[PDB]
Write a protein that binds this ligand. Structure first.
Ligand SMILES: C/C=C(/C)C(=O)O[C@H]1C(C)=C2[C@H]([C@@H]1OC(=O)CCCCCCC)[C@@](C)(OC(C)=O)C[C@H](OC(=O)CCC)[C@@]1(O)[C@H]2OC(=O)[C@@]1(C)O
Ligand SMILES: Nc1ncnc2c1ncn2[C@@H]1O[C@H](COP(=O)(O)O)[C@H]2OC3(O[C@H]21)C([N+](=O)[O-])=CC([N+](=O)[O-])C=C3[N+](=O)[O-]
Ligand code: BEF
Ligand SMILES: [Mg+2]
Ligand code: NA
Length: 994
């Protein structure tokens, strides 16, 4: 029964045809289960461990690198006895690499959690219902609950389903709905209907929502909805219905392939066009047996040299190391991609309650009377440190620590806090954290008492569990609580009646300890306590008290204040009637005022500095909360989002004012406003959507169910370690630490990561261009193969893969976080740089092929074959006279390729150094600036002389150790590349905005 909030209590019973006294009959239960299904969320499952392998080989590059491996495989057996010794090595290694990078991607996906399986960690286990079955309440599986059921809930219980309240048993019912609505203060519920059908959760004051918990009281209600129809059920669907795009870097890597593929097939044809000459030379030798063998031997060499076979490894390795570093900050990164994406973050949307704040009522201010002298009244004001329920913090006076016990007024304040209180504090030994037990407001008082420790109780030698009630416990033994007059809306105060317990102060007689909203309590005070004695309440005194009360309840404070008072001479229990709260106020009269406490849902310590760092990095921080505006804004001020006295004219909006804005204005609002209060889950997602529409990489920070939609939608979702399950599964990152400032570090990390990735991506793709030129040139000049895939792979995976990683360790700039985020659309290579790699590439194809042909024409120990006898090395056998001189198999010599490869390797090493900086000269930015790179070079070159000496290698790689003189040539051919780039860089810096 949706809309049950607008219907009356009888209308809801009628609607389900159930009795409030007995509850559904087992027959009805069976019928409702039939018509409504169990109270749970369907298991969210998709893409098994095998479905990934499927989409794994969907990568265009892979398919091409695979479609090529098939060709190379056919060309393995078609090899006569001369090189059929390693004829199957190539077609295999190519595949072996397709398998490696295959599981490389699966490893970066398999490691994922389950959303719905985590949601059950939030979905209540059991529930309490009354069914015709038995008179007594029955605890059952919360999943077996059905609409129409009569449910009972009491303090500490987790509401099991969306429930229409029928009758409140306690004097009042307070409910903590922060996980769903984001409200920082428990909610006082009622049973009257809520007229407006368009009412939002924060307005449904006669409803109880599944997942929330009871802060105080006992109530009976009727289930309105269950399963996916519950408020949290809806939000879980919103979450499942949100789409996410690929990583901008991934979209960039895909487009690259989409284009690379068009180029490959474009070159395969461009070179094919230069083969019409076969249909002219009067000669035959292989129709459908060899009349197209040499073609597919290069076609594969093209696909191998055009693809950076080692990019996935370098990328995964870089990301993984990044994630490891993040972990050291207690930042658990779920998705490796977001590791880098975090660097382009331009906006950080952030939830308030539990995310920006601790969501743990904390008393940070209190005061008692110092002295009274006629019209003169001074107050002892103190502040308290600590923003959680942990009994950790100190009481200060004028910014300096003091012993509360040395103040008689404080001893009493603490005593009222410990006794006029129905809640307590606890240490969850499981979650390893202090939790409230009962009302947040009352627990704040409990931890206040533990901090004050007025009796200097020994607590250093205690365990976390015992430490939670040591002081409170000491005070609970001084007085015996006879009865308590629970809180009521009219009076707006609460009190307990106590009698002396110990035989130390049995002459003090019965006392009444009161607490409540300031005004009422004070107006009922005839006396004021000064230390241990008492003076009458006078105007001057009252005015001074209220004025300070006013200061805290507004302005820079905007704290929640409670006054603490005690009735020195309370009525006798006999002359009192305790079954009606309408009489309570009168018993809580003629009171002696003792003090006041100021409390609030505190911002996490590291937030203010965090936001200041973001501003310097050109990153906006927007608050998106479900809580009311007054509080939303008060925190914005306290953390730097708004100035202490700034006029939040058009910069703060409620979920409604927002809606009253036309989409245009709405959209614009997301770029101006920094605070959105009384918003709903979809409002958060919408806001995030607007931002992204402006091409802004947005992050979202949250803890509650109400944050899940926006967290998933965000390029980078960030969840608090102490937040809900849904929120954590919808995030790529989790601050198990709850330290909001780890975000700024993660961003910094991400920026250093992005720059380094850009650099090594460029490096690898760069040599790929030159490699393709070398293959092209040879396939064009008719010249023999200077480089073969067996060599291209080793270099693309090892020789270069190593320096590329060392570039991932490129030190970040000194102002890495003193500049704005770079655009997502920003291309990695274009404009000048496109030309630079265009030239470097060309220089490589020419150098490698030229180094080969050089050995084939000028090597003092090589054939002096003419350029013509090289371009026509094929017809060497038949037309032997034209090539009268040596052996026709010299065109398969390792020296030429080794010459070409050794030039390639050396050029890349040189290009590695050129890649340390996009436009900075090796003069301005020394090579040793990155020691790791220098190492990767020595290690790459060693892995080279290794491939030229260890027999098993030079054999399969078709190589042969070069002369100590041939190297001198490789050097002369290679080194200059440093000069070429040094020049291209120079042009960019000076005669360009480089
Ligand atoms: C891997 C090797 C090669 C040679 C390749 O075909 O790369 C092209 C290509 C697909 C792009 C180009 C290459 O295009 C050319 O070099 C022009 C044609 C001349 C070839 C003639 C044959 C002798 C990149 C490599 O080259 C230069 C030299 O500037 C730069 C850049 O790529 C990147 O920024 C990498 C993205 C991960 C891309 O223009 C890119 O296409 C895009 O959409 C981009 C935006 O991606
Ligand atoms: N709609 C309401 N109807 C009646 N009382 C309300 C309402 N809203 C808030 N209150 C009471 O007004 C206070 C906020 O107003 P300031 O700080 O600005 O002066 C609130 O403090 C406590 O109940 C609240 C409370 N609590 O959880 O919210 C718990 C209490 N307790 O048992 O410990 C006591 C409250 N109290 O007021 O005494
Ligand atoms: F929990 Be919030 F601030 F929406
Ligand atoms: Mg929240
Ligand atoms: Na996300």
């Amino acid at each position: 029964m949706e809309a049950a909030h607008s219907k009356s209590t009888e209308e809801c019973l009628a609607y389900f045809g159930v009795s409030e006294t007995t509850g559904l009959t087992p027959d009805q239960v069976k019928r409702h289960l039939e018509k409504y299904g169990h109270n749970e969320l369907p298991a969210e499952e998709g893409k098994s461990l095998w479905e990934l392998v499927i989409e794994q080989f969907e990568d265009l590059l892979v398919r091409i690198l695979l479609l090529a491996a098939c060709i190379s495989f056919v060309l393995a057996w078609f090899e006569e006895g001369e090189e059929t010794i390693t004829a199957f090595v190539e077609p295999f290694v190519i595949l072996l690499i397709l398998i490696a990078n295959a599981i490389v991607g699966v490893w970066q996906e398999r490691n994922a959690e389950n959303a719905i399986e985590a949601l059950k960690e939030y979905e209540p286990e059991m529930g309490k219902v009354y069914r015709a079955d038995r008179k007594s309440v029955q605890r059952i599986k919360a999943r077996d609950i059905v609409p129409g059921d009569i449910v009972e809930v009491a303090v500490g219980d987790k509401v099991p389903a969306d429930i229409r309240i029928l009758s409140i048993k306690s004097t009042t019912l307070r409910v903590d709905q922060s996980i769903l609505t984001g409200e920082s203060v428990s909610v006082i519920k009622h049973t009257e209907p809520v007229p407006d059908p368009r009412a939002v959760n924060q307005d449904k004051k006669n409803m109880l929502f599944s997942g929330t918990n009871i802060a105080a009281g006992k109530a009976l209600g009727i289930v309105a909805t269950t399963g996916v129809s519950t408020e949290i059920g809806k939000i879980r669907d919103q979450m499942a219905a949100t789409e996410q795009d690929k990583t901008p870097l991934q979209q960039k890597l895909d487009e690259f392939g989409e284009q690379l593929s068009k180029v490959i097939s474009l070159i395969c044809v461009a070179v094919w066009l230069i083969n019409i000459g076969h249909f002219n030379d009067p000669v035959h030798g292989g129709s459908w047996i060899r009349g197209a063998i040499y073609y597919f031997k290069i076609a594969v060499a093209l696909a191998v040299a055009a693809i950076p076979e080692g990019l996935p490894a370098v990328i995964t390795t870089c990301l993984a190391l990044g994630t490891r570093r993040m972990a050291k900050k207690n930042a658990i990164v779920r998705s490796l991609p977001s590791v880098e994406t975090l660097g382009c973050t331009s906006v950080i949307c952030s939830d308030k309650t539990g995310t920006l704040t601790t969501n743990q009522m904390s008393v940070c201010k209190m005061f008692i009377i110092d002295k009274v002298d006629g019209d003169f009244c001074s107050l002892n004001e103190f502040s308290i440190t600590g923003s959680t329920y942990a009994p950790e913090g100190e009481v200060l006076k004028n910014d300096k620590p003091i012993r509360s016990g040395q103040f008689d007024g404080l001893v009493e304040l603490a005593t009222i806090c410990a006794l006029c209180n129905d809640s307590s504090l606890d240490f969850n030994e499981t979650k390893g954290v202090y939790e409230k037990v009962g009302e947040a407001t009352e627990t704040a008082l409990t931890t206040l008492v533990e901090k004050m420790n007025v009796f200097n109780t020994e607590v250093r030698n205690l365990s976390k569990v015992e430490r939670a009630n040591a002081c409170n416990s000491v005070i609970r033994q001084l007085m015996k609580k006879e009865f308590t007059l629970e809180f009521s809306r009219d009076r707006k105060s609460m009190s307990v009646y106590c009698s002396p317990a110990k035989s130390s102060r049995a002459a003090v007689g019965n006392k009444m300890f009161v607490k409540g909203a300031p005004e009422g309590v004070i107006d009922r005070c005839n006396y004021v306590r000064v230390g241990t004695t008492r003076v009458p309440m006078t105007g001057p005194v009252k005015e001074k008290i209220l004025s300070v009360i006013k200061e805290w309840g507004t302005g820079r404070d905007t704290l929640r204040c409670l006054a603490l008072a005690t009735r020195d001479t309370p009525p006798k229990r006999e002359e009192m009637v305790l079954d009606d709260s309408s009489r309570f106020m009168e018993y809580e009269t003629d009171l002696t005022f003792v003090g006041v406490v100021g409390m609030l849902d505190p911002p996490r310590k590291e937030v203010m500095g965090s936001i200041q760092l973001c501003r310097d990095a050109g990153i906006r921080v927007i608050m998106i909360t479900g809580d009311n505006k007054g509080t939303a804004i008060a925190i914005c001020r306290r953390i730097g989002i708004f100035g202490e006295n700034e006029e939040v004219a058009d910069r703060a909006y409620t979920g409604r004012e927002f809606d009253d804005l036309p989409l245009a204005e709405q959209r614009e609002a997301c770029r101006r406003a920094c605070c959105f209060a009384r918003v709903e889950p979809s409002h958060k997602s919408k806001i995030v959507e607007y931002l992204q529409s402006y091409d802004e990489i947005t992050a979202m920070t949250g803890d509650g169910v109400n944050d899940a939609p926006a967290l998933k939608k965000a390029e980078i979702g960030i969840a608090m370690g102490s937040g809900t399950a849904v929120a954590k599964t919808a995030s790529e990152m989790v601050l198990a630490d709850d330290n909001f400032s780890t975000i700024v570090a993660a961003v910094e990390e991400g920026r250093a990561i992005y720059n380094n990735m850009k650099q090594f991506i460029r490096y690898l793709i760069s040599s790929n261009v030159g490699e393709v030129v070398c293959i092209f040139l040879t396939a064009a000049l008719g010249l023999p193969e200077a480089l073969i895939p067996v060599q291209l792979l080793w270099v693309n995976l090892v020789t270069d893969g190593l320096p590329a990683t060392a570039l991932g360790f490129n030190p970040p700039d000194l102002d890495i976080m003193d500049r704005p985020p770079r655009s997502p659309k920003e291309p990695l290579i274009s404009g000048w740089l496109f030309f630079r790699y265009m030239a470097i590439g060309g220089y490589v194809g020419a150098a490698t092929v030229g180094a080969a042909a050089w050995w084939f024409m000028y090597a003092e120990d090589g054939p002096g074959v003419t350029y013509h006898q090289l371009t026509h090395f094929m017809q060497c056998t038949e037309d032997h006279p034209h090539f009268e001189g040596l052996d026709c198999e010299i065109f398969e010599a390792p020296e030429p390729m080794t010459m070409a490869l050794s030039v390639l390797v050396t050029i890349e090493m040189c290009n590695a150094l050129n890649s340390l900086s996009e436009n900075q000269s090796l003069m301005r930015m020394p090579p040793w600036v990155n020691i790791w790179l220098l190492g990767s070079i020595c290690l790459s070159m060693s892995l080279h002389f290794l491939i030229l000496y260890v027999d098993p290698l030079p054999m399969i790689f078709k190589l042969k150790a070069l002369d100590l003189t041939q190297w001198l040539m490789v050097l002369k051919i290679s080194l200059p590349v440093i000069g070429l780039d040094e020049i291209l860089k120079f042009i960019a810096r000076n005669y360009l905005e480089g």
